Structures are given as C-alpha cells and as structure tokens.
Design a binder for these strands. Structure first.
Lengths: 260, 167, 73, 140, 172
RNA sequence: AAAAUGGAUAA
RNA sequence: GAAGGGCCGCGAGCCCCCGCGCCUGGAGGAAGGAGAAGUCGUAACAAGGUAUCCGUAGGUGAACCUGCGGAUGGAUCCUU
RNA sequence: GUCCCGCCGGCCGCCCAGGGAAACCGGGAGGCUCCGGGCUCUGGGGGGAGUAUGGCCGCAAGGCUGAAACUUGAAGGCAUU
RNA sequence: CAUCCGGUCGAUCCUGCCGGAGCGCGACGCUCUCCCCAAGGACGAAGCCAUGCAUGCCCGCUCACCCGGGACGCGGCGGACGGCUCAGGACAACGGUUGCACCCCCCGCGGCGGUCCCUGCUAGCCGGACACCGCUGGCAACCCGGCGCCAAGACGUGCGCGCACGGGCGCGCGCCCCGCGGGCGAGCAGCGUGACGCAGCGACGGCCCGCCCGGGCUUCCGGGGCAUCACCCGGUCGGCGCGGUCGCGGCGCGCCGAGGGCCCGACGCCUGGCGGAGAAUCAGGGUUCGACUCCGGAGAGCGGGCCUGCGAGACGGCCCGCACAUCCAAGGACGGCAGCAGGCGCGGAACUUGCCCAAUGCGCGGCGCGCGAGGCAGCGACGGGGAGCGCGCGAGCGAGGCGGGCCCACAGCCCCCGCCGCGCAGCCGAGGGCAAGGUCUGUGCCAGCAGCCGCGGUAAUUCCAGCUCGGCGAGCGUCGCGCGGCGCUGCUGCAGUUGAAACGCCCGUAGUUGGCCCCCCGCCGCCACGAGGAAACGGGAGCGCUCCAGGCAGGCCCGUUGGCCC
RNA sequence: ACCUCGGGAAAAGGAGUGGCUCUGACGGCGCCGGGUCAGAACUGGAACGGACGCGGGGAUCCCGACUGUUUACUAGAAAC
C-alpha cells in the first residue's frame, strides 16, 4: 500500500453504478471530490454509460476540458468528478436540466427538474462543530461547509443549499411527520413516512419508515434523509417509492418487449 | 530503527511471536531528547520533521520558563536556576536534565515583584524572599521544546520539601 | 494484582459438523480502582478503554457479589 | 459405543474422530506424509531416470514367466528403482546408460498382477515413446 | 490481469454414472436414428438440459403451494416451455414439466421441426440441409442444425432466401 | 510299545 | 560551520559456545519382506501319535521341550 | 409343617417374544436402518509390529506408551456336505 | 439429482478389504477438418540471468544562433499507484464486528480568510545565486571540477491592521445521583483571562477548519497439526512516573509490587502453511482444495540502516555487511528480470527478445502526450462450446484457394458477396466385471497379456498377426491427485461374545452427564424477525451472440434494460 | 554424556574485578554499635586475583572398586 491507492478495478467497482464486467479490468476512478465513493457515481459514468452520450473516454474528456459541462452551479472540468444524491447534473448547452436521485432499485438515475427547482440543491446536516475558531459550522454530505448555522437546526436536519447563491435559507427537522427518503442498505431509495424514531445508547438509532401503500423499511438514523415535510422539496423519480415486488418487476418488463 | 512496534515483544503467555514484517517508518523512535540546562550558549531547540507535516521542537538546551503562582496568578518569565528530585531518576537531575515533571528552582527576583501583598500564600511568600522558588516543569521539552512550570503549592509543596528537607 | 482484575468470559460454541456445542472461555484483563471491592468468583461489567496496558484494555463500571461460602453471564 | 451423547461434548467428539481417523489405512497413507517422502517418484506422475542394467524377474509361481525389467536410477532423488519394460519385444529397444521416463503401475504404487519387485513402468526410452517404437509410429 | 479470464464457460455433457449398459446404449442408437443425432454427446447435451428442467420443477412442485417465490420461479419455467413449445397452453402448470423427455425436447430442433414440415427431407438430408444453409426461419440462413426453432417461429420456418443461380450439380 | 516323509503346475 | 573525532544507540557480519530441527556416510551385527521345483527334522490341524493354547521362568541345531498357576477357543454340559 | 403362596438381593438351568452371518443370548448378545438415557475404553484388510526409536517405571527379567519404510490378496467368523 | 458390481469355497451366509465404474485437473502417448470461448515457468530452484524495453509528462521560466510558441536545463506535479511472486508468518496475517473521549492524512470539495509591536519598512514589486550554457579542464570509462555570464509562480528576507495569535503553559464543573445544549450515550468541547513563543501565513495571501480518499492502532469473537510437545513466561504480568511516537500502549526507560498462561492442551516444535470471498466432488450430513483472476497481507539476492516526502524502512531509491558477479587503461569503476519478452539450471510439466495506445483505466496538460497496466497478434487438444467427414439416386455444398467488402491502431480472423473449388478418422477394446467372434494363422507357462479374478505347458474366447465386432469419437487411451463410491470414519450413521477391538479390578480429580418439583423475573443458551454488512461467484427474471459455450445487452423500448436472492 | 541416581561438577564454556565520590539495606534504644553487603556515579596509556597465594581442560581404552599398605638406602603398582 505504501502511499495512497491510485487506480480502481472494475470487478471491485460497485453493483449500484453497474459497469460492464467485460471491456476493461479497470474502471473510471471515483476521483476525490464532493461525494463519497460508497455514495457517489463518477461523472464519466453519468456521461458515457448513463445517457449513452459521447462515445469514448478520451472523447468525453475533450468536451469536459472545453468547458461544455456544468455540475452543481459550477462547471468543473474534472473527467471522473463525483456526482451524488441531489447533485443537479445538467448541461446548459444541451439544455438538459436534470437532478440525480436514488431509484427504488438503488441506482441514482437522472430525474428531470427545471431551473426553478435546480436553483436549490437539498442536503442534510450530519455534524455541527466549532471550526475556524469559535465560529459554529454546519457540514452537508457533499462537503458543503456552511459557516454559522441557524439556531433552529440541531442535527439530522435538512439544508436547502442554494447552488450559485450557496446559502442556507430553508430548514426542515427530522422529527416524526416529515417524509423521509431512505438512502442506505436494503430499501436504499424509496420514500415513506416516519412511524417512529427509537434510540439506544451509543448504538444505531432505528427510524421506522412505512410507504404510502404500506410495507415497512427500518433503516438506521445515518442513512435516513428528509426530502420534504410533505411531498418532494424538488421532485420524486417517477416511482414515488412504490418498490414493485419481484413478480411485479417481471410484469412490467414482459410487456416492455411487446410494445416494440 | 528504534522501533515502537509490538512484533518484537513477547505475547501474553510469554510466548515469543515470530516476526512477519520488516520494520516500517509508521512505527519509529529517536534517541530521546534529554534536555540540558545552561546553568554553567543561548537556548537552542532543534526542530525535527514529523509524520503529518507537523514539527516537534527538540530541546537540546533550554534556560528560561514561564512559571505561574498558585493563587495570585502572577505568571512571570524567569530563569530555571537549578533542577532537583526528578523522581523518575535521581541521575537525570544530577546531569541537569529538564525533563517535564521535575522540581526546578526558579529565580525569586522576577516573582519578588509580587512580594507586596500579604495573606498571599505565606509559605511560598517566605520562599519568594529566599533566592529560589521550587516549581515543577509542566510542558514536555522533548516534543514542545518550551518548558513552563507551575509554582510548588499545597500538599505537593509539603511532600517535595519533605523530600528535600534532610539536606 | 496491582489495580488489575483478570476475568473469565465463558461461552458455548455451536459446532455444526457435530450438532453439539463446545465449552470455551476467554481470560480478559480490566482495571479496578479502590472505588469497587471485589473477590474471585464475583460478577463485574468491564467497558472498553484506551489501551491502559499490554493486556488491560477494560474498566470495571459495575460490581455484584456472590454467596460468601461454568456460568455464562 | 459412540456415546459422548452430550450437548456439551462437541470438543470430545471432534477430536475422537480426528485421532481415530488416522487409523484408516487409506487416510494414513494419504495424509501422514510418510509416502510423499518415501515415493521414489516423489508423488510426481512420472520421473526421469538413467538405465543401470536390464534384469529378469521370474513371475509368481501360478504364472511362470520371465518378466523382463530394467533397473533405472531416478535423476531427481538418485533412487535405484526397478521398472518393467512393457508389451512384447520392448527390451530390444532399451539400452544401458540410456535416459528413461518411469510412471506408476496404477495400483497406487503397489505391484500390479504377478511382477515380483516391480512397481513402475517405462513410458519413454531416450525421449522416443516406448509405445511409439512398438506401434512403429516413431522408430529408434 | 486480462478481462479474458473473467468468463464463465462450463460443460453441457452429462456423461453416465455407468458407461456400459447395453439396454441404454442400444436405445441410444435408436434415438440417434429417430432424430439423426451425430454423437452420444449430442444426446448428452439435451440429456443434461432435460433432467435439469425436470429437476427445477421437481423442487417447485413439492414447494410450498401458491408461494410468491414458487410463483415467480414457476412462471419463468412454464413460460420458457410455452414459447419454446415443449409444454402447452392447456397444461400451463408445474406438474406437466416432469413428463418431458430428451427426444420430446429434440422435437423443437431444426432437424426435427423441418422434418415435420418435410421442407428439408429425411433427418439425414435435413442435417445436410442446415449445414448447406438451404433452410432458415428466414434472413439468417442457419448453418447450425441445433437451432431450436421456437413454436412461434416454427410456422415462420422457411426455405432459404436464396436456395440452390449456378446450382452445384449443374455448375459445370 | 515303536512309525518320519511326499516336488509345481493344471486337471 | 566541510573533513574528521568522543559517546551512546539501532544494528549487519565474523568467530566461539550450546540447544534444537532436518537429512545422512559406515566395517560389522541383527532382523523383515519378496526368489517356479534346495538341505534338516516334523512342531500344529483327527485324542495329529506327549489334548491344544495363555501367563512366567529355565533349557535346546531347528521347529520345539519341561516346571508351576490358568482357559476351553477340549477329547467331558451326564453320576454318594 | 423346617408346610403353601409368595416379597425383595443374588446363584443358576430351560427358553416366549425379539435379535443376529450363524453358533446361538434371551436376569441380553431383546426393546436399532421403524437407528439418539448417560459416562468411559478400544478397533478399521492380512503380514511387518508390540517391531524400531524417544521416553518413563523396574535390582533385574521385563512392563506401559508406541512407529514407519516395506510387502501381499486374501487373512479371518459361524455354519453345511 | 438417495444405484452398484469382479474377487477368500466342494459350495453357502458373513466380516473385511483388493479391483472396476463416474466426475474434477494436471502430466504423458498416439493422433487431430474448420470455426468459436480460451487458461497458460504456481508446483522442496522466492535458483541464476545476457539483451531490449516497463514513468515520464509538462512549460512556471527563453537573450538556445527560425517565433513569441519553443531545444534544453531549472521549477512544478506524479513516480508509494500500477505490474510480479508467495519465502516468511500457526493465537499473526485473515473474514465479520467495534472503538478512537489516543491518532495522522497528498489530491479534489466547500468554508474560513485582521496577525502584535522594536516591528522590518520600498511595495510602483525588494535581495543574490542558480543550472543550461560561454571559455577552460581531468580520466580508459563511469564521472564531475573551475571561472565568468546568468533564467524564474524556485529560495531568501520582508507591504501586515493590539478579538495580535502556530503549537504548547497556569487559573477558570459540582458537594448523594441524574433529568438542557456547539455538544454526546458518556466533562467532551470551545472560549475568555493571565504569562511565554513570537510562531505558521506574502515579493503571482494562503495559512487554516470541515469533507473526501484513506492509513495507524484496537474491541468482541471465529482464525493448521503434533502429548514419541505438561508444565510454562521472565518487560514476561501489573502499578507509578518519564521519555518516545502521527498517537495509545514494557513502546522503551527508571522505581515498586509478583504476577501472567494452562488437560476447555498452556509451552514447545513441525508444516512441499499466504489467508478469505471462492473452487472441485457431490441425496442429506459432507469431504478435500485453498499458488493464479477480486479483497486484504508480505517480499524484491540475503540481512540490515537511512533519505525525498502527506505518505517508502522503497531495491526499475540510496548506504553498509554478506555472499554472488561484471567491466577495466590495473589505478579504478558498477550491479541485481519473485515486470514483459526471452534465456540458463531444474523438473513429469508451462508460450513470441512481436506490435501498438486505438479502446478500458491512470498519471501529467486543458488546448495530447506517457504506459511491456494493457489492447492486439503469435504459440496454445488445461480445457469448453458449436458444426464436419455427406445427402440422395439425384440434388448440392465447404475445408480450402481467388478477388473484393467489412473489420481493423495496423494488418488479420469473424461475417458478407461474387469467382472457383483439394470432405478429410483416430484411439482402444472383444473370457468375466463390461458393451463386443465360439473365427482363423502363429507360439508352446517361451514370449507376452492381465487395474482385479485370470490366460499362455502343441486346439490360446486372454498373447503375435489378419478378419469381424463393440466403446467413445477429432478425440481416445495411459499415469499422478482429490471427491463420490465407502454406515471402508459413522453428528445424522460404525463395530467391540466368537471376525479387529471392554483397560484384571477398585478408588478417584479434570472433564462429561445428570430425578422429581416451585405458571406468570433477571441473566443466559435459545426461539423468530430485523437492520446493516464488497462485487465477482453461485443460483436467478428477461433479452435467438445464426444455435450454443457466451454476454449485458438491445430496440423505435418499465425514467428501455441490466433486476433479484445470496 | 554417563550414573551404583549419591555422583559426574570447579564439568566444559563465558562475563566482571582498581581508586575515589556517594547511596540503600543489618541491630540494640532515641541514643548507640558493627563490617558485611548490594548498588550508582566520576575517573585513571584499553588498568584492576596488578607482588603474593593460587586447577590447564576434554574424548576413550586397560587393570584394580574405593580410603588405605608395601619392598627403611634402585620397583608406592595392576602387588597386599
């Protein structure tokens, strides 16, 4: 190991991005940036593999360094920059205005949203700390280090980062009665409502979550994320967190070939 | 060299564990920085590069420390006149090491400026009119490179004086 | 020992090739300060601590007694 | 009695089979490792040798025939082994001080049938196949 | 190192547990005659598949009845058989799967369904025809007779788009 | 009371 | 503040001293296993010509023999 | 009356089931492939082999623990002629 | 996915093993018509290596003797990742689980952004030297010397705003316990105030805090054998300082106390010991394998020792000792393929000193390079898949040639369309198991065969031929190994009267096992369900690579997919 | 190693040893012996049992068990 790991092997690469096992022992590197390796998708994956856009990785890079692409209100010409939950992946030149959210399956896919809802990127406060001297601070998962937080926000709270404005104006709590999108483990990407929140000393706090139809999901407090008090604050992927069961998935797919 | 890793040490039942790795920079140690007083050459303190870009001030020699009173909090820059009773080792105090935790005599003259008040720690006030005040060094010269001490007061003054009273 | 207390944590191990279980024990080490008075044969809860020694990594935060004249607790 | 019928007798039960298992002859030859050292062929499928002298071993009394054999010196571990030249008229091809390949007789080292003192076969003489020099496919 | 090595490639042969029983072996010549199969391997290929198809059902037939896992896994197997055509739209059930036999599986092959239409002649001529590419479902002159034309495309089965302009017999 | 032996190999 | 030194540490290497593991040369001594049809007796299986055999001690070319206690796996399921 | 029926602890003979390759046990060697009350020892084809060595115990004689290389297709149980 | 069968006899029932039978995966022999998916010097030599390559990229700087871009230097960033092996390591590595209130962390991400005064003073921007080079030098070489010119986003000082502040230092909870938040489950943390240090930050304001990616440890457990290893350990076990470290800890180092571990196998030795996810083989229960593909570990001839750094005790870095070599002008000098290709040795065993970034990554560069990571080609019956070697009585083809097309980094192959046209079988058996001659010559218990029983002594069902025939088939035999067979290991599920085997018996501590009873609670064990744990891999839904072994594709499609259970 | 389990044994094989300067231990009864012990400095051409006194050691073989006794004045042995 000596120093730091510099390459990524595709077979090790995650099941959520889903890369073609064939076509390269190596995979694009989830290079350092705003979102974590477990919870991020490389932009070159969301350029080449996702929209089947530009052809090769070299070709993708030429457009990237021509300053043709925009991520989260800034352009960022890094080729495999991290794209995460709520990261507003949109191109003004293509006029494709989208946002990146988790599917019921667990792979974040592009959910289209316009400038009105692309102005603000939603996020959660994980840690409040006293940093840069006695200035209290607030940290979001995409490493958005806002400074002095609002008095109402404690922790597990939600921040509307304003992208180019880059300030917190809207604060939503995690207390029971706020619609919560799960982002971890098995449910990994379906909306619901908090039936209850239960804590144990120095142990994962378990938050009960049941979907609008029914069906329970009991993810731990860290993964739980408050998308809105009621309804999406920006948009919901067209699944609404239904989670169609295993036979149901076959039902949807079988007619899909028939439509052609 | 000078390793701090556990592979070399014996296990719990005293069974020797076979070595599985050559030594590595992550676990390292250096010839200790014994800190020599300059009672008999200005204070010179080497700066040693460390893991993490941080730096440690190696105390080859030190002569002056900041010592603070136990009630009036005078805190006066002074001179370490001499060193006594290291407790970890008698010889360290005989070679004038200033290892932290050692009783040191500090010059009464800078801290005598506080002699005007009365009811102010009478046992040490007597020691303030006496050419030396005992104080225990409270920072590590080997890592910090700067030694500051607190005035000897309370029951500790009694024990450390009891220790130095046969003389 | 000096401000120390060696504890036997005993558990049963379910081997499957033979559906039967084994009987195994771990000798663990903890720090007891004069706060708690104990005897060999007493039940104590030990919490994990910053390595306090080569083997003492635990602290006694609870103590219960036993009649003055293998239990998997 | 297998007994040891105790929920808490798994330790005893695990060892009792491990200890008694070695008794089984097939397991004992298999994992004692005594044979991995003893095998002249070293457990290899085949091993090279230099011919030392052609020898005739009379077969078992029920089947009276002069089996023809060659004493070969293993190149790897310098062991003097006796191999049986196979088929009919094969000895005429074999020459003294000539390299040879030797492989097992297929009973797992034991002698096969009536050859006294022979446990190995001669697959190749001087590189060229013994079968080939017998089927004529490759001659001397 | 090398993406090549990450390929899952196995073996379809289901060689017998006992290799020399004449009752079974002679029937092999008989089935070989029935469908014109070239090698014992060419029977072995569908021998594995046939037993496996029955084996998966024999698990789900004794499986909890009307179970969600059974329904999803049974749906797949039955559907496979309805489109291929080994099972039927009347049977439509796990129970009918066990009856299938290797030769009944061979029925869907292009050496067998071409024979039922009689487009390519006896199984002897028929195997010759696919190798010569004079028969195809259409647009893919099939070289390989193993093509198991599915029931949907059995009606779609056809003579080659181009059959025999300078025919070989009269070429010179 | 004293009595030892019988090749090999198939039949 | 270079070449150097003094002193500790970390520590190769070489030598000695012992321990261990691992294989191995060797007169000669003693076995064991396999050589189509050697010599000497016949011990044992029929009460196998002195019922066999266990123990233990002594003898003898060799099987074997004898003492003293045992078993029947005996040649006796049977007798004031 | 040293009767009769026995009640328990043994000593034994025949044996109903039932078991086993059978001889035969049956107060078990029965209640097992319709297999599971508990604890302990001990074996894994026949020779080499209780041999070699390493112990240990013994005055010795020897005892207890205990190999491998190597060989061979039978060795062996109860029965019937 | 639960199966047997040849064999001890005049025969019989056993016990019990020898022999086949299948599957894997390797060596070997004879052979092989095209395609397709292809592993490939792991195997008591982690032995030794000739030769060539495997990390260079930039341009901040140009007064290089062609243009404002540069050759080179210097500056910058990465060289620590990637590639290779598997020696060591046997309570270690390693899987799951924990904690850091004991830590460190390049790059990217977002936030912060006063730096005191003598300061020091010029910020209209300061200081001198510094390679390449000019000229002159030394050796056989490697190799550097001197003088002068001198180049910068390099250094070196320094523009600096008393809520000045790098690190570190004293005083700043309570009073039987908790029940608010910058906090947490926990007194953790911030910040003031007094002294120090004047410290990091700038001559193209970045020091910092968070975040990422990780490393350093660490918890609870799992984590080879051997008793022909039973006693073991001596900073070892604790406390108390003090050093040291990125930090905690006998991590060292004083002083003190006598601990620590074991028949629930301690300690010692041994191993052709990397471990896991995984394989193989297979009713169930399993059993063997875990060199290689991903994940973690450890090594670069062998021991050490260190530097540049955010990270290396690094060997395509250095410095030594040891061996092992070279080169030499004899004074000197310089190594190290367990990278790739290819030697040499060794073995039964394992391929071309090919080409090329075009992909897929990664470094560096925004104005394309760099890559023996790879991609491709060659070798390649480890193997695996799919068609052949005719069909039909008359209809045709294809292995090839031959030109295109396409593919292609470039050839090629695949695949297409013409034109033509060479279809093409071997290995093993035939008394029995076990499928398949009551045929014929040879030869005489010779030769040979025969896994096992057996055959051969002048009628050979068995050898040497020929003839037929059977097996499988471009493969088939022969060995070595594991698994099933084998209730021949017995937990399910062994046997001990005589086949092999109850110790002569008793006492007995380890263990191991234990009546009955007492609804309605704690700690168990447990019982069920969860949550969170890497994909590959196993399975598994769909999707005609022409079938297929395959694959994540594809199509005018669920936000089309690619799920899902592990 | 061997062993009559005592021996072998001082086995073999190593390391240290001066002067000065200090410091802990050891008792009686608050004052008072003692000279043995551990330490720890600092120092002297790299020197310390500095003269003295004062084993070389190991592997076997052959006698005789041994401690003893003997030919005063040539044999001290395996002889008695």
């Amino acid at each position: 190991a000596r120093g730091v790991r510099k390459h990524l092997k595709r077979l090790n690469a995650p099941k959520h991005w889903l890369l073609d096992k064939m076509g390269g022992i190596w995979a694009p590197r989830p290079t350092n940036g705003p979102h974590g390796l477990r919870e991020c998708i490389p932009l070159i994956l969301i350029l080449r593999n996702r929209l089947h856009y530009a052809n090769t990785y070299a070709e993708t890079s030429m457009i990237l360094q021509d300053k043709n692409v925009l991520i989260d209100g800034k352009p960022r010409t890094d080729p495999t920059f991290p794209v995460g939950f709520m990261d507003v992946f949109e191109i003004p030149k293509v006029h494709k205005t989208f946002r990146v959210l988790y599917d019921v399956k667990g792979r974040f896919t592009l959910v289209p949203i316009q400038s009105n809802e692309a102005g603000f990127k939603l996020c959660r406060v994980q840690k409040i700390f006293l940093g840069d001297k006695g200035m209290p601070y607030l940290s979001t998962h995409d490493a958005r280090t806002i400074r002095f937080p609002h008095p109402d926000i404690k922790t597990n709270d939600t921040i509307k980062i304003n992208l180019k404005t880059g300030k917190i104006d809207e604060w939503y709590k995690f207390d029971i009665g706020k619609i919560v999108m799960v982002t971890g483990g098995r449910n990994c990407g379906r909306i619901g409502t908090i039936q209850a929140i239960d804590k144990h000393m120095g142990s994962y706090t378990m938050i009960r979550m049941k979907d609008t139809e029914g069906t329970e999901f009991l993810t731990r407090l860290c993964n739980v994320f408050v998308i809105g008090n009621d309804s999406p604050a920006v948009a919901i992927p067209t699944t609404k967190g239904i989670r169609p069961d295993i036979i149901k998935n076959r039902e949807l797919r079988l007619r899909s070939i028939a439509k052609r | 060299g000078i390793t701090h890793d556990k592979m070399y040490k014996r296990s719990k039942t005293g069974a020797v564990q076979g070595k599985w790795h050559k030594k590595r920079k992550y676990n390292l140690g250096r010839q200790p920085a014994n800190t020599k007083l300059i009672v008999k050459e200005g204070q010179k303190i080497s700066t040693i590069r460390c893991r993490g870009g941080n730096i440690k001030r190696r105390a080859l020699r030190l002569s002056h420390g900041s010592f603070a009173w136990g009630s009036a909090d005078i805190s006066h820059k002074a001179r370490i006149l001499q060193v006594v009773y290291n407790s970890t080792s008698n010889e360290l105090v005989r070679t004038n090491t200033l290892v932290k935790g050692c009783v040191v005599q500090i010059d009464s003259a800078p801290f005598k400026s506080a002699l005007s008040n009365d009811t102010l720690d009478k046992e040490i006030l007597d020691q303030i009119r006496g050419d030396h005040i005992l104080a225990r060094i409270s920072s590590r010269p080997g890592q910090v490179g700067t030694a500051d001490g607190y005035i000897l007061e309370g029951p500790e003054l009694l024990f450390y004086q009891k220790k130095l009273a046969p003389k | 020992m000096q401000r120390s207390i060696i504890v036997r944590r005993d558990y049963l191990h379910f081997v499957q090739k033979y559906k039967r279980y084994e009987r195994r024990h771990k000798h663990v080490a903890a720090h007891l300060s004069p706060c708690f008075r104990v005897k060999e044969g007493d039940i104590v809860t030990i919490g994990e601590c910053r390595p306090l020694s080569k083997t003492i990594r635990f602290n006694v935060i609870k103590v219960e007694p036993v009649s003055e004249a293998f239990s998997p607790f | 009695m297998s007994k040891t019928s105790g929920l808490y007798t798994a330790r005893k039960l695990r060892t009792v089979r491990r200890v008694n298992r070695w008794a089984d002859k097939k397991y004992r030859k298999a994992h004692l490792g005594t044979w991995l050292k003893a095998n002249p062929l070293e457990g290899a499928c085949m091993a090279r040798g230099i011919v030392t002298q052609k020898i005739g071993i009379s077969a078992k009394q029920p089947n009276s025939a002069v089996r023809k054999a060659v004493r070969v010196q293993l190149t790897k571990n310098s062991k003097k082994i006796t191999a049986f030249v196979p088929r009919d008229g094969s000895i005429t091809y074999i020459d003294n001080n000539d390299e040879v390949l030797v492989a097992g007789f297929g009973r797992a080292g034991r002698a096969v049938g009536d050859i006294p003192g022979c446990r190995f076969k001669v697959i190749k003489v001087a590189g060229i196949g013994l079968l080939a020099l017998f089927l004529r496919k490759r001659e001397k | 190192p090398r993406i090549s090595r990450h390929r899952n490639s196995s073996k379809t042969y289901s060689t017998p547990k006992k290799p020399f029983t004449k009752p079974r072996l002679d029937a092999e010549l008989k089935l070989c005659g029935e469908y014109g199969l070239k090698c014992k391997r060419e029977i072995y290929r569908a021998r594995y598949m046939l037993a496996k198809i029955r084996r998966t059902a024999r698990n789900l037939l004794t499986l909890d009845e009307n179970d969600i896992k059974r329904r999803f896994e049974g749906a797949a197997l039955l559907r496979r058989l309805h489109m291929l055509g080994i099972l039927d739209e009347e049977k439509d059930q796990l129970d009918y799967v066990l009856g299938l036999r290797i030769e009944d599986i061979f029925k869907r092959r292009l050496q067998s369904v071409i024979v039922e239409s009689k487009l390519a002649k006896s199984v002897h001529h028929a195997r010759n025809m696919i190798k010569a590419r004079h028969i195809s479902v259409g647009g893919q002159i099939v070289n390989i007779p193993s093509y198991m034309v599915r029931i949907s495309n059995t009606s779609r089965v056809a003579i080659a788009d181009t059959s025999s302009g300078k025919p070989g017999r009269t070429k010179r």
